Symmetry: D3
Subunit: 320 residues, 6 copies
């Protein structure tokens, strides 16, 4: 549980800095003998500004996207400046509350997504396309989501559209064998869209609820991964596009999502290896940047270690 340790440390450091400025403000009032007229201080811009400048530095070093750093700064500044604190109250809690609110607001996307609700109301099959670079944990995630879907009453078939990774496909089939879901695949190096469109036809004929599409995570010979993704999305017309990312790649995940998003619009996000994320700045940033909710998080190597995302659990982890 050194989880989000670096983010937590920088937010903690900000709170302390401001707290100490507020404390000087109180002592000034006490010293000047103003206690016969005033028992509160009003947080001023000079109490926060340097602390805000250093938070910008610290958060950028902690992998927080610039956009999110700016949104956080202004929310906090707006919540604090002019805020009245009575001498002898816990100023730390008042300051931390503003930060916590700002962070919580950062986690809001213009759409929450109830996966089960979305599938139930939809004309079957409900088609989910996965995007992401190799190493993100896409393949395992798809098996785990299949398991979760099945455990919730839905039938599922998987399209192996990662056609050039015979290893990944073999893995995919072993897991799918173990959970009783079918994998549709063609020959090595097959056309990814044909494979997926095939899995869709299979789903229609056998009345399967959900089609999950495993995709490639690198470009093969002359044609962009992004182009291939657009072609799969044109052919399969997904109900939902999920971006998969490795929480440990703090230096790349937001940018990876940005690249995919420009090609095929992301509806939802899944973060793997989150339990091992000792930093947290990227994970905190991604929903905001892509304006898409995090649907699931990987917190272990077991099938039940793919958990639906809960905002409050995430905040608990950041703040303690």
């Amino acid at each position: 549980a050194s989880m989000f340790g670096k983010l937590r440390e920088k937010l903690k450091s900000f709170v302390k800095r401001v707290e100490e400025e507020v404390e000087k403000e109180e002592e000034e009032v006490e010293k000047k003998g103003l206690l016969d007229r005033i028992l509160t201080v009003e947080i001023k811009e000079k109490d926060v500004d340097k602390a805000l400048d250093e938070l910008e530095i610290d958060l950028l070093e902690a992998d927080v996207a610039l956009e999110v750093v700016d949104a956080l700064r202004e929310k906090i500044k707006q919540k604090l400046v002019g805020k009245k604190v009575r001498i002898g109250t816990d100023k730390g809690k008042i300051i931390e509350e503003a930060v916590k609110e700002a962070v919580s607001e950062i986690l809001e996307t213009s759409r929450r997504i109830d996966l089960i609700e979305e599938i139930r109301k939809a004309e079957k099959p409900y088609v989910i396309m996965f995007v992401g670079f190799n190493g993100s944990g896409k393949t395992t995630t798809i098996a785990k989501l299949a398991n979760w879907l099945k455990n919730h009453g839905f039938s599922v078939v998987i399209a192996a559209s990662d056609t050039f990774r015979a290893g990944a496909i073999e893995q995919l089939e072993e897991h799918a064998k173990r959970i009783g879901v079918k994998v549709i695949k063609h020959s090595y190096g097959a056309d990814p869209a044909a494979v997926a469109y095939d899995a869709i036809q299979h789903a229609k004929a056998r009345g399967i609820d959900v089609v999950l599409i495993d995709t490639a995570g690198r470009s093969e010979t002359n044609r962009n991964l992004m182009d291939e993704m657009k072609k799969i999305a044109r052919v399969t017309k997904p109900n939902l596009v999920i971006f998969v990312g490795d929480a440990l790649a703090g230096n790349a995940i937001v940018e990876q999502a940005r690249q995919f998003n420009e090609a095929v619009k992301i509806d939802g996000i899944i973060l793997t290896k989150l339990d091992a994320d000792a930093r947290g700045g990227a994970a905190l940033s991604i929903s905001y940047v892509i304006d898409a909710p995090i649907l699931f998080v990987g917190v272990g190597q077991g099938y039940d270690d793919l958990r639906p995302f809960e905002k409050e659990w995430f905040l608990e982890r950041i703040f303690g």
Copy 2:
């Protein structure tokens, strides 16, 4: 040769046949054979088969754009069509497919090379684009020969300036057929060399200028930007994309890339005689909306042959 594509078009016909058969058996059931002599193909008859054809065609390297256009050209040529109960549906259905494929090979311009040249103010400038290993260099030698045998004078610009090997090869074949090669020093500016060739052609009253271009980015780097610069400077009458037909997994995407930089007027496919798949070759004209002008069906100078849509269709449908 095109066997794969032909295998797939063949099985689609078979599947539609089986559905039409059930349509007839259905008429049989209601004991209406005594008064109804025809059934009309319904969408329910072609639908699953069309989905299967989409799969099959994508796996055979047919571009998405073309697969979608084919589905609709066919789906609409069959649905509502009346067929005679008891006859062989095979001819009829295959006919519609054959038509759809034929329309797919229609581009918005046809190009009569000799006619375009004669009417044009000399020199007529032709720019070739394409990646290396598609036989661009040899193609340019062959096309030069062809133009001469039709009475045009020709000069070639060696604007593939970083490939000394290719340039040597080019001068050989050019000396062999009595055509001049204009070249500068190693690593010269491609546009400068081609512009130079053009001034020479004006001065000496040459009919045709062929610009041999690079087929890879140099260190500087970008191939597409280099092609843009050459087109800007030389203002080509005609831009021809050269591609190796055996590269079914690439050739269409190659053309798309060049097309975005400099608009392609015509296509030449090499090694087409050896193409036993044909999805890409079938796709390229539609995707780029440019006619295939010649095809390479051998290693002889006279194996670069004017493209005929009809020969192409025959090869497909056997």
Copy 3:
């Protein structure tokens, strides 16, 4: 130096001179230069210029100017045609070097609310790191306080070199740990300058992409964070087959305000140096003509023209 450029401009002038003489000797009070006198020479000039790394855009603008100055120009018989033609050409070249805004660095710093923030862009090997040290020295010698941000965070070597030079000339370098966020370091440096009333902050930036993401995006991020007063492209004049394309690329991401060309003194072709300002629409501010600190010289259009013609 600019030898190749000079040789081809000279042949063009002599080529037209012949046609003009050959028209003075067609009369026999004035002779008029005609289109037929400049065309073939212009076309050959185009070939020659392209071979000397002159950007096409610049080649075309030169054609246009030379043509509008010469065609229809009437000159007295007996006069020196070669010199009149060359003067036209020289005017054309001089206009090519004229940018939509000359820039007085010192004036811009003084009239600006401190700190004046300069962001450098360019690829590695362009002399960026050394150039920043020299510019810092120059700025100090005109009585400005200076601080340098080591935002080239993945090159421990270049940062040591920077710190050594800076120490010599009494300039502080701000740096974080290895591979730090470049925008964070620059922002930090700016907060310091504010706190210390420093006049100038120089931002040293990466010159390659990391196992990470586009150099171009990184530059945009830095620019957003620091809101530079001035953005300066650094380029190596010997890279005639590259620098103009380099600057186009950068200019696309973050608008360039001025150019510094290094190793200019060794440039014996010059087409690229002649082109770069016109193409990016930014003045050349300093040129590097040696390895000494005083070898980063403020740029003079005149000096450049003299090197080109004679």
Copy 4:
């Protein structure tokens, strides 16, 4: 503790196969009515040979070096063939005992090394050179060994001869700061041997017991990592050369050690991330191939998670 799971599974499978052949042999005796004359069976070659052929296949797939596969086969064959088993005894235990012995014999190197004993008897400083490719965990290991050495009464200095990795050096110094040991370093890209020779001079003058040399784990521009290692070894004349390897790189660790060994002779081995090794074939093979004992193993991310190697703990892990 899916630790060494794949190796364990293949050895288990071998035991079962032979056990079933022995069981048929017993039933044959019982069936033929020979119980009035014989109450034991003698394991024959035909009882083991196919099982031995499949063990060779299985062990090669489990990353066991060929050399070790051959040694294991012959030891087992020799222990089993002609072995007398009384009907009604536990044949499984008898067969497993032979396998366990063979495996244990495989772990014997012509030298065990008592590190503390070696340092105490030596003219100070005792110089240890580390070799290994990047990603092996060399740098962290050196800090941890420094800690262990210090906790055992020895003073320690570290040479930063990994001169081109400013990141790794910074890490190295943070850890060394935390445990109170000095790091000697020069400028970026400095000569690795000069740095190490410098740390040795420092050690002589201040009477430090141990010098640890952090080395590069990749070739820089034109000159082989192996050449650089030979040059460091010529200059520093180490008392001990330790090869560091990432237990998770089952496909490479034995070969990595082989390459280094040919250049500078390895005295001892350290395996990191062993606790996470779900295979075990390489770890089992390395001592034998290089004829060098494993001195320490990494079983966690804490400083006390670098543990002295014990053969019996290793066998316990393999067999259960």
Copy 5:
């Protein structure tokens, strides 16, 4: 086909013929070829052969043989010099193709305790995978049972292709999971062949290093595990600037017993094909002269010589 080789051998013959005629016409019962008659032509032959991909070792051996056959040779006046010289040259070339042991494959299989194990070595693109299928077909057509080990474990594509061809010709392929240990697969295949009384096991191997370790080491490991009856190098005849070096490399790790050259029919230079057997000291066993199964032909020295001379 072998055109380049033919052209240069022919010019050498004609060059010496002149010197010999020019010596018949110096007498006037016999004329003796002298060193001064062959030297300059030999030196020019050396240049020409090196340019046609003939290995230096082979060029030198040819010099030696041609020289020992011609110098001091006395020929009757009136005789055809060109033909006598050419016969010498032809003998030299023929000896170059003679290896320290011709090999009768069928005989070796029959007289050997089954299974006879063949291990193939070579780099990707040499036609190894296709060649193994064709060799399997050939072996079956002579009444041997065959099984193939898919030890090229990191190429899912090539293994599918293999399995397709093999299925056509009634041959089983043994394979494990993706990226399996190559030696393990081959050993497995051998245990099967034993169990099933199969005559021949063909081992298909990798033709590049993985994110792993040297192809050459992998080949040694496989050879140790399988103790091949025969090791066969496969090479693409069109790779004249590579194949001999390829075989040297392999031969160094695992001794090669024989060679198969593919695409031989398209080879219009031939220097490498002429060289490979002499250099590695192994016979060429089969040549690929087309895409049909019957286009893997047993190799005939005579056939090769006829293609070279006429």
Copy 6:
């Protein structure tokens, strides 16, 4: 220029001085100044300083072999040496260092180029080895000029067959000084071209053949094997390694690699005038046991200058 090396040799002298001073102060203590006029340098006086010099020299790019040889040549030139109490030790100590450095520059053969050529049976064949960017090509042009100005006829073989750029450059400079360049087509066999050059020289009675060689592996590939093949075929009288002196982190290791393939007889260092470090330049002759023959101290033809050990020592010790 060589400032780094000079900085380090300078500080070693200073450290030995300080120790010798303590030796004298020690004599002072025992009140023996009245009868003893000299002290002899002991190993305890040079030891720590020699360890420091090892560090300093390694960091300055001095090869290990040379650092070790220097330590011993010095340690043995100083230990046991008597110095005069009260004088300046600086001259004395520096003298020993200067000597050690001088011996380090001694190779087992000296090479008089003109003399070796005159006595040899023509053509005298010289093979150049080295990696690209070390100025091999230009060096060969300059050396050609020099040979001519000393009355030798020269032909050059263009065996750098895959670099059309370099070959053009070479022909220019060669035409400029009236020397012939023998070349074949692009990508020709280097040994064939050089052998060809040699036959030409015999035929036309040329004194000297200079073989321009490749400086990188081609796709085939190996550079060293290619050099072996060329030496085997051409049987060089002399093999010269060319290296850029500014590459202090590489040049010695480059020479080692070539030396292992084909034994180097002499060395030419380019851009030496710009070398402000000098550890590598100081090291190379010893490591390879081959004399530096010429040095490049400028861009002029006459800036390729015969090497003089004495000039070199002066440059170091100022």
